[PDB]
Design a protein around this ligand. Sequence first.
Ligand SMILES: Nc1ncnc2c1ncn2[C@@H]1O[C@H](COP(=O)(O)OP(=O)(O)O)[C@@H](O)[C@H]1O
Ligand SMILES: Nc1ncnc2c1ncn2[C@@H]1O[C@H](COP(=O)(O)OP(=O)(O)O)[C@@H](O)[C@H]1O
Ligand SMILES: Nc1ncnc2c1ncn2[C@@H]1O[C@H](COP(=O)(O)OP(=O)(O)O)[C@@H](O)[C@H]1O
Ligand SMILES: Nc1ncnc2c1ncn2[C@@H]1O[C@H](COP(=O)(O)OP(=O)(O)O)[C@@H](O)[C@H]1O
Lengths: 173, 574, 307
Amino acid sequence: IGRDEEIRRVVRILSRRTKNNPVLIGEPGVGKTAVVEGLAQRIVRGDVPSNLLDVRLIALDMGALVYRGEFEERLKAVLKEVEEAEGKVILFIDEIHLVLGASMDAANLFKPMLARGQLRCIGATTLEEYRKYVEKDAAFERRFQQVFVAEPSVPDTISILRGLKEKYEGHHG
Amino acid sequence: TYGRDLVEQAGKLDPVIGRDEEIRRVVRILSRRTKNNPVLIGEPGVGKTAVVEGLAQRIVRGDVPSNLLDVRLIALDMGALVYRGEFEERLKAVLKEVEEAEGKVILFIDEIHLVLGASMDAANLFKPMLARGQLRCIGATTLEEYRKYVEKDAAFERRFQQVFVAEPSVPDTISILRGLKEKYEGHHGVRIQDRALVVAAQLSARYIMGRHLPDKAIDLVDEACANVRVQLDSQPEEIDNLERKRIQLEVEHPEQIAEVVSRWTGIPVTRLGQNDKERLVGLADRLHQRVVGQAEAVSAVAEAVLRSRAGLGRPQQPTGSFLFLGPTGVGKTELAKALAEQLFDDENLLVRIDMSEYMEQHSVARLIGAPPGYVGHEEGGQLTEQVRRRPYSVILFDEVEKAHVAVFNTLLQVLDDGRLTDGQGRTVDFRNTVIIMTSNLGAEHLLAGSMKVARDLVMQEVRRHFRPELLNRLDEIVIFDPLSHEQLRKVARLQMKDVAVRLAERGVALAVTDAALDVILSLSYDPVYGARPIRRWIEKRVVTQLSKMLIQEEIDENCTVYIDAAELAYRVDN
Amino acid sequence: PVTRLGQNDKERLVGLADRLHQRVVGQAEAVSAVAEAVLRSRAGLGRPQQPTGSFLFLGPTGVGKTELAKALAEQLFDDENLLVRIDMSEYMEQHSVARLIGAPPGYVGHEEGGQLTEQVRRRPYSVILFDEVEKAHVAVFNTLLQVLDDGRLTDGQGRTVDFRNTVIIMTSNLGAEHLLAGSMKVARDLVMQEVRRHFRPELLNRLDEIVIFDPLSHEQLRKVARLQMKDVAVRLAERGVALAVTDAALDVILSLSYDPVYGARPIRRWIEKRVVTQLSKMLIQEEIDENCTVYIDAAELAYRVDN
Ligand SMILES: Nc1ncnc2c1ncn2[C@@H]1O[C@H](COP(=O)(O)OP(=O)(O)O)[C@@H](O)[C@H]1O
Ligand SMILES: Nc1ncnc2c1ncn2[C@@H]1O[C@H](COP(=O)(O)OP(=O)(O)O)[C@@H](O)[C@H]1O
Ligand SMILES: Nc1ncnc2c1ncn2[C@@H]1O[C@H](COP(=O)(O)OP(=O)(O)O)[C@@H](O)[C@H]1O
Ligand SMILES: Nc1ncnc2c1ncn2[C@@H]1O[C@H](COP(=O)(O)OP(=O)(O)O)[C@@H](O)[C@H]1O
């Protein structure tokens, strides 16, 4: 609860025709996965505008998905087979910088279809990784737009504690 | 086959207009007997692919001279065409299988430098037949690639000629927007206006800094075009916000395009209302609380902010610069803190810059963006990343005079006409930040005192110390007037209100009389030091006395203390 | 543009002086010198071993030394900021020659791009402007003698760059006190003898012409006041409000806030900080409608609102 702004921003940017791949930026410990799960709950409930009522959210797990050639052809088959939806599926990736900007060489392989705009991707990382990895190349800057998340409101935290009190009360009794 | 054909795609690529010059240049250079391989050069974001598609449309329609009426345009896709040796032999097969035309085909390559000048070794392989002149090739890349890739060898310079593309024409961009309006109107199906279009075109080139030449206004208009559909055609969001706040309560128990640019980087240039009316009216009165008896500086800063917000003012200035001169401990930074708190809800967003450790001129490399020459690791300067992504901040200096001449003589260019270039060559805009400086010179001459002769002495000293040039640029220089007994009493009351509220947080009320203020100011006043001793004395006496009396459990709830002259007498009552 | 001239070039070259005589007021000598230099270069005559004119500007501060250069740059071509600004405020030590000119590729050869190498390349018709020339090191300044002699220049890589069409223009602040003290002939002689004694008696022969700016008088003050009024007038009229003034208003404006030493900046500062803030404050309270003209007259100042 209490994250009404980032969901609205993501809804606004996703419906845009071109350059519609938002990337969450911010320091750790503020709730990036929390707002992602909030968006998932919103689409499950159906409060989102009906323009995205025929989309299923799928996440990628590095540990679950893991010779380098075997890993490469497995991933290539994965992004070849996800194409059966053709624009009605959203792919979520955590720790984009480690698996893309890096070590293993995959940036050149991931560039073509991403530039073509095969699907819509969502990322999440800290701003230091943005300053250190993505600013040294002119290719990835074509897409992706910054979205800033911060929680400096002391009065808001009380609402979060009130919301989360019930689970702990039930567990401890 | 494995490439890409563009003849049939021209039926449904977007129309391109307003590029009548580069097509003519390419047509003229393609009919030359020898050295007829044009290469497009220019910064990204201007439309190199756009003019290529325009040429393709021209040849499809047939307006091209008949000398090139028997030619098809084939493009090459790196990803489509991709062991290294297998790749080499496949490309070799492509280049010998394309020879069946023998001069009646043009090969287009994008990002020629990455795949040719480079890693994989193909330059020596591509040199011989290219020098022979088997066909005609077209490239496209930026100018830095030309600077650092092709100038290091004497082979590729035999062919290829530079073609320069740029879009600095503001009036032309309006034509581009009018041309591209139809596709977005058809896709969204919502009524639009023209004044909004021209306003967006005018605004896109001044406030939002970055990207490149103003062909980026399409994204700005598309943002609002997408927002309006969800706002109106789809479910409204105001009711959703209202019901969300109701749920939270239950749990605990042409104007449109102005909004997007406002929320993009700040700078609330949105249309003003009655709330802004009385806020701007009462800005001076609200700012006249933390500081006392400083009418000149308060009026200056208030009128500067109001003038900047109204809509007038030269667009080649940082919207005000000031120099503060006066005694120590009079409230120089208190006015800056109060102004920062009043302008926006933040308390410490202002950036504090001091040069107490900038005595040696070798500190320029860390004050400003250092060159990437040696290691390029500490490129983050002192005034580089703070102003970026936040151009509405307030920058505050401190003891400016104590700096070296060289370090201080690099902030003249920004005070002249704004903008600044760092080692990396990026231009950062100081077009909305209020620059404020301060210094302690001329304190002795002022505290010695007539007032007029002291002011003249201070002014002549500051004129003689600094060069007679920089003192012209500063918008206004003001001197703080030492305060009197009434200001002393008011500041004493203001200081005591803080401990009053801090104690009242625990549930104890405070009340005092005029005689208490009189004795407090009489016992511990020094004209030289200003106002610090008052706070030090009142704290070190009253707080310790109250805490010592409270520890012994002499205070209950709903108890009010009273202070009066005898020194001081403490009375405890309900 | 060495192409053949027509009647449009005819009257353009005829009226170049008159058109340039707008931004700069009461400086006939420098304006005439620049106009004749440009006309002579365009006509077709002139020695082919010169940069087509070099000038030195000497005078008080805040008189309009760079305003003439800006107006000339705007008039010559439609660009407004194509001129290259070169300053040596950070060139006190002679070790900055390697960055002023094309550095040798000896050590790493990475910063080979000099200060005066890539700008003039692919653009040999530009205008190069110096600033506070006297505040440089002697060794640093003693490297441009060769170009002023016969053109051309060699950098670290050995490439020859040609300064065969660029109008080199410099300026300096020396001799200000002697001029502002004042007869005028003795002040001019003092300034000339000081500048001769400071510099070597060799370089002063190469410069085509040295001129001194004459301090302006009351009529020039009134004209520049009107010129400064016009800017805010058009800026406000962009919103749809007309402006009008009287002679007495200009008289009081120039009388209240004039200082002979500083030149013309205080006039602009005062007029802005008073008139603009007064008009903005009165406009905020919604006292202005469309098709409304403001009038200013002496009493100080009185503001009258009318259709
Ligand atoms: N609005 C919220 N309500 C409840 N819990 C939250 C909220 N926002 C954040 N959190 C908590 O913060 C944590 C977010 O951690 P996360 O940012 O994913 O760590 P990292 O940045 O290392 O991945 C979650 O475990 C979640 O419990
Ligand atoms: N004359 C024009 N009319 C309409 N759109 C244009 C025009 N010129 C450029 N554009 C837009 O600018 C973009 C050019 O991008 P491009 O230069 O290909 O990027 P990059 O340089 O990174 O390859 C195109 O997407 C096109 O929509
Ligand atoms: N209206 C006021 N007039 C004078 N002094 C004030 C006023 N309000 C606060 N002060 C005091 O002035 C102090 C500010 O000190 P300051 O002048 O910033 O020191 P320095 O000049 O060494 O930085 C604050 O500690 C505050 O207690
Ligand atoms: N015709 C004129 N005569 C005198 N001053 C003028 C004229 N036109 C403009 N000015 C003023 O002269 C100023 C130029 O200052 P300048 O002499 O360049 O300072 P500096 O010599 O320190 O570079 C401009 O700000 C402008 O307001």
